Design a protein around this ligand. Sequence first.
Ligand code: ZN
Ligand code: ZN
Length: 221
Amino acid sequence: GVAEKPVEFVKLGTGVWMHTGYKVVPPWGNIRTNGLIIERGDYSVLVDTAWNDAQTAEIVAWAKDTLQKPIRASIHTHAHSDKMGGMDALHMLGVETFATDLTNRLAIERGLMPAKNVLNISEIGSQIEWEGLTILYPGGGHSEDNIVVNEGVNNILFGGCMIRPGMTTSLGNIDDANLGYWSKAVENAANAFPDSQIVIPSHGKPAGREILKNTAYITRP
Ligand SMILES: [Zn+2]
Ligand SMILES: [Zn+2]
């Protein structure tokens, strides 16, 4: 198969960095997965692992060594291996991990390791403030447990796998999707965070609010 592309880091805003890792999925090629590192003074917090422990350890080392703001804690945006494939690395590297109770239960069922701490959002529309970020459960979409994360200083909305890349018509991995609610969940996220000017999908490049509108259109019933 083709070589797996290396992990990448790019600055999205003041104190906000995108991590990207790659996986070769036969019989095709590399697929990216994106998460964030967010600076919090003298430490940082992480949104999502990469695909596996080795990529995730590289991300932790980058925060410690380049930002000099080591990762203290992390949040995971649903129970799939692009988001939770590196949990064992986080736990060994002393990162305190958080996910919803539903995500943790699905992780165990799906062969992934659960996070150490529960985020108490479980009803549609529930929000909490966590390490300066707003975390919203908008309802099931790409996965029943999918959550989104807003960084209100730079106005960056992390949509994760609930937001599809660019102007795609492909729905990606829908094995666990709530096809009936997905478009409404995208609308819920868009309405909850109207000021965010940058939107990050897991599997494509950073964009504007047009990827919210495009995802909502392509996943509509
Ligand atoms: Zn997924
Ligand atoms: Zn994904």
